[PDB]
């Protein structure tokens, strides 16, 4: 079982585009100390990936006395793997405020200023190269994105996101599934129940119901990617160019990994029909 | 001889323009909580007036075991001030850091990034409306006046000081007083005996022998106004009107200042030691 606690974590990561290896490395029989630093990295850049806007807590993972897995914010367990994937988006749960946008309304450093993302570059400039700790409230940018950015200390970060629900990504990927089917009278069975049931209860409803509780088993229900959060340092976190080059390769990573995203769930989706 | 540690105090504040009123809280029979509070509100005044570059330090006022009065500087006891007024002078002089004009050299708010003392006032806008902390270097205003403004927290603060030691301003305020000499011979020479013994000394040559000594035994001998500090709070510490408001009404004050302690010290000078 515990291989199975190895390729869970691994799922769940990858799930936010962490390649963690954990599998793998603990194949190695490595120590503790590796596997818990490796376990801590990847739910940090997950969390960082995910948009559940908590920059503000503290997130780390770690091996416990009975072959389980712990996570941790603050220092305080939130949840076990065990426990079910659900189980830990409903324990992530209480600790958010997404807005109607789905954009956490949390601040990153905590309680003080925000300059509103409506800045036009030269302040938010004036800002990067001059001010010491900062950060702006969400901006529309260009293909429906949103963005924001903070310094903390040395490290700046500059957060891109295109909210989606587990749901919604789940959506797009059934009407991907949908758009590639051939045999022409299931594509009119699934669109004919589409209209009462949406895309997405008609194509679960085409499983069998096997694949319904597989589905219901994975993480890709509640968790998908996002945002991207990209991170300088040094002299290189108070570079408008920088700055600049790092949003455009976040807003790149966003694309790339959601369309991976929608792939995978594509494939995911299809494999549930293929031996209904 | 608590009496006199009291009008002391006073005097020594009176060198700040800060009316303390330590004498006349004590005799009201004020507890002691309430006398240290009011020590060291009247301290830091002065502190910040004093233009001795150590507002990065907390300095404290309070009352002693022995009924004396014991100044400490980040909690270490500096002097007390039956020791004398040069002797915290002295006790003063390891953590400055003045430069060749006479200004603080230290950092404000500790470690961290401090902007150019030639930062264009547009951008300088950006930084109060939006930065969370941040702290300017000196930069030049007119008049041999120097300038600088940082934030900390929830407060803004704008210094304009003008470098003046001690010695310095008796030197100018004995040049007045010779100004004012009506008798044409009497004046040259003593202009004469200045280009060597040094203006202070000569106009101390007509008086008691007493002259050089009691002077030195005055708060005047070791301190003087050098800089003003203006401190704003809330939604006006982010208001560039409300600054530039701000810095005009500093530089006022420290003309003003500076020109009744140029006055006042004319006139004792003039008559001086009067010793009883």
């Given at each position: 079982q515990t291989d199975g606690i190895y390729a869970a974590f691994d799922t769940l990561m990858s799930t936010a585009?962490?390649?963690?290896q954990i599998a793998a490395l603990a194949a190695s029989e490595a120590d503790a100390g590796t596997l818990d630093a490796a376990l801590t990295q990847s739910l940090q850049e997950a969390q960082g990936r995910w948009g559940?806007?908590?920059?503000?807590l503290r997130h780390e993972a770690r091996l416990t006395d009975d072959g389980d897995i712990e996570i941790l914010t603050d220092g305080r367990p939130?949840?076990?793997?065990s426990e079910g994937f659900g189980a830990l988006a409903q324990a992530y749960a209480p600790m958010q405020a997404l807005d109607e946008r789905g954009l956490?309304?949390?601040?990153?450093?905590?309680e003080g200023y925000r300059a509103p993302g409506?800045?036009?570059l030269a302040q938010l400039k004036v800002l990067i190269e001059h001010a010491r700790d900062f950060e702006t409230d969400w901006s529309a940018g260009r293909g429906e994105t949103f963005q924001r950015v903070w310094r903390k200390g040395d490290t700046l970060f500059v957060e891109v996101a295109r909210p989606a629900s587990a749901e919604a990504a789940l959506s797009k990927a059934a009407w991907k599934v949908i758009a590639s089917i051939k045999d022409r009278a299931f594509q009119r069975e699934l669109m004919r129940r589409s209209e009462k049931d949406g895309m997405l209860g008609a194509l679960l409803g085409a499983r069998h119901a096997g694949a319904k509780a597989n589905l219901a088993q994975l993480p890709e229900a509640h968790f998908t990617v996002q945002a991207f959060v990209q991170t300088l340092s040094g002299a290189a976190a108070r570079n408008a160019e920088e700055y600049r080059a790092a949003l455009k390769t976040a807003a790149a990573a966003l694309e790339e990994y959601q369309g991976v995203t929608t792939r995978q769930l594509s494939e995911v989706l299809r494999h549930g029909l293929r031996e209904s």
């Open positions: 585009g962490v390649d963690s559940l806007g908590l920059h503000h939130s949840a076990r793997v956490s309304q949390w601040a990153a450093l905590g409506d800045l036009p």
